[PDB]
Amino acid sequence: TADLMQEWGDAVQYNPAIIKVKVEPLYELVTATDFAYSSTVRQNMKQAL
Amino acid sequence: ISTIQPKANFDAQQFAGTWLLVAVGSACRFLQEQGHRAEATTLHVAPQGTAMAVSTFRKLDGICWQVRQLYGDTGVLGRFLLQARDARGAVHVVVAETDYQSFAVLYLERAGQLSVKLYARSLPVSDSVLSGFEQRVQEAHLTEDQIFYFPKYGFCEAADQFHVLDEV
Amino acid sequence: PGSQKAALGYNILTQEDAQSVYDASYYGGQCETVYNGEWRELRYDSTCE
């Protein structure tokens, strides 16, 4: 029923799924600001990944 | 804020049935903050001994909702207690005036927070009655600026099985 | 709610819960919370409508 589709779409505001995603690989978080040997860890992550 | 006298010889069996909310006045902010689009509200009043089961039928985004509530008898005729289900507090409801085929003026207070409502049996309402309500609002000490008339049409009855709060 | 069963051990021979393995009630002084997307619960203020 159109009513239940309305109710579903109302409730999606509060608990949505992720339809589209644009992602970066996690090594891009490895940053010298946080970690010694950042480059080395980064490269290791590339290889491991 | 006082326990004004209820309707002289209030009768749930005469007050029973359909009632149409005409207007409310209260400080309750949500009456004004998102106070727009207040849906038409109608009560079915059903005697349940000295208490009454009251079902408010209302729209919410066009979803027709029925709220089942007991106006529990205080033992004073026409004064009722709405029990709190860990709600913010029980509501003392005094049916202060009515003509059972015409109008009712219900006084409701929780935690010392008072509200007054005009209900009618008919879409047309004698301006006499409404003016009287206004008077009792002034006597309520509520400003006229707190009166919120409700839209004349778009009442709903017989909410879906899934659109009932069953609050009791 | 229901986090406790994830704690309990499992007996594959009987498919029955055991005693707790994990401490289901331990927080380590941390205050990680979880957004409950179904939190919506209708309430009607009679005094306000």
Curated annotation (Swiss-Prot), chain A:
Q: What superkingdom does the record give? A: Eukaryota
Q: Where in the cell is it found?
A: Secreted; Target cell membrane
- Describe the PTM: N-glycosylated; contains one or two bound glycans. Not O-glycosylated.
The free-text function statement in the UniProt record for this protein reads: Component of the membrane attack complex (MAC), a multiprotein complex activated by the complement cascade, which inserts into a target cell membrane and forms a pore, leading to target cell membrane rupture and cell lysis. The MAC is initiated by proteolytic cleavage of C5 into complement C5b in response to the classical, alternative, lectin and GZMK complement pathways. The complement pathways consist in a cascade of proteins that leads to phagocytosis and breakdown of pathogens and signaling that strengthens the adaptive immune system.
Q: Which family does it belong to?
A: Belongs to the complement C6/C7/C8/C9 family.
What is known about its subunit structure? Heterotrimer of 3 chains: alpha (C8A), beta (C8B) and gamma (C8G); the alpha and gamma chains are disulfide bonded. Component of the membrane attack complex (MAC), composed of complement C5b, C6, C7, C8A, C8B, C8G and multiple copies of the pore-forming subunit C9.
Q: Which disease is it linked to?
A: Complement component 8 deficiency, 2: A rare defect of the complement classical pathway associated with susceptibility to severe recurrent infections, predominantly by Neisseria gonorrhoeae or Neisseria meningitidis.
Protein name from the UniProt record:
Complement component C8 beta chain
The organism's lineage is: Eukaryota, Metazoa, Chordata, Craniata, Vertebrata
* Gene name of the encoded protein: C8B
Swiss-Prot record, chain B:
Q: Where in the cell is it found?
A: Secreted; Target cell membrane
Q: Which GO CC terms are listed, alphabetically?
A: blood microparticle; extracellular exosome; extracellular region; membrane attack complex; plasma membrane
The keyword Cytoplasm belongs to this UniProt entry's keyword annotation:
no
Q: Describe how its activity is regulated.
A: Membrane attack complex (MAC) assembly is inhibited by CD59, thereby protecting self-cells from damage during complement activation. MAC assembly is also inhibited by clusterin (CLU) chaperones that inhibit polymerization of C9.
Q: What keywords tag this UniProt record?
A: Complement alternate pathway, Complement pathway, Cytolysis, Disulfide bond, Immunity, Innate immunity, Membrane, Membrane attack complex, Pyrrolidone carboxylic acid, Retinol-binding, Secreted, Signal, Target cell membrane, Target membrane
Question: Which molecular-function annotation in GO is an example for this chain?
Answer: retinol binding
The chain's disulfide connectivity reads C64-C156
GO BP terms in the entry: complement activation, alternative pathway; complement activation, classical pathway; killing of cells of another organism; positive regulation of immune response
Principal place where this protein is found? secreted
Family (UniProt): Belongs to the calycin superfamily. Lipocalin family.
Q: What does this protein do?
A: Component of the membrane attack complex (MAC), a multiprotein complex activated by the complement cascade, which inserts into a target cell membrane and forms a pore, leading to target cell membrane rupture and cell lysis. The MAC is initiated by proteolytic cleavage of C5 into complement C5b in response to the classical, alternative, lectin and GZMK complement pathways. The complement pathways consist in a cascade of proteins that leads to phagocytosis and breakdown of pathogens and signaling that strengthens the adaptive immune system.
Q: How does it assemble?
A: Heterotrimer of 3 chains: alpha (C8A), beta (C8B) and gamma (C8G); the alpha and gamma chains are disulfide bonded. Component of the membrane attack complex (MAC), composed of complement C5b, C6, C7, C8A, C8B, C8G and multiple copies of the pore-forming subunit C9.
Swiss-Prot record, chain C:
What's the protein name? Complement component C8 alpha chain
Describe the protein's quaternary organization and the partners it interacts with: Heterotrimer of 3 chains: alpha (C8A), beta (C8B) and gamma (C8G); the alpha and gamma chains are disulfide bonded. Component of the membrane attack complex (MAC), composed of complement C5b, C6, C7, C8A, C8B, C8G and multiple copies of the pore-forming subunit C9.
Q: What does this protein do?
A: Component of the membrane attack complex (MAC), a multiprotein complex activated by the complement cascade, which inserts into a target cell membrane and forms a pore, leading to target cell membrane rupture and cell lysis. The MAC is initiated by proteolytic cleavage of C5 into complement C5b in response to the classical, alternative, lectin and GZMK complement pathways. The complement pathways consist in a cascade of proteins that leads to phagocytosis and breakdown of pathogens and signaling that strengthens the adaptive immune system.
Q: Domain of life of the organism in this record?
A: Eukaryota
- Give the family this protein belongs to, as stated in its UniProt record: Belongs to the complement C6/C7/C8/C9 family.
Q: Which disease is it linked to?
A: Complement component 8 deficiency, 1: A rare defect of the complement classical pathway associated with susceptibility to severe recurrent infections, predominantly by Neisseria gonorrhoeae or Neisseria meningitidis.
Q: Which residues of the full protein are shown?
A: 147 to 195 of 584
Where is the protein localized? Secreted; Target cell membrane
Originating organism? Homo sapiens (Human)
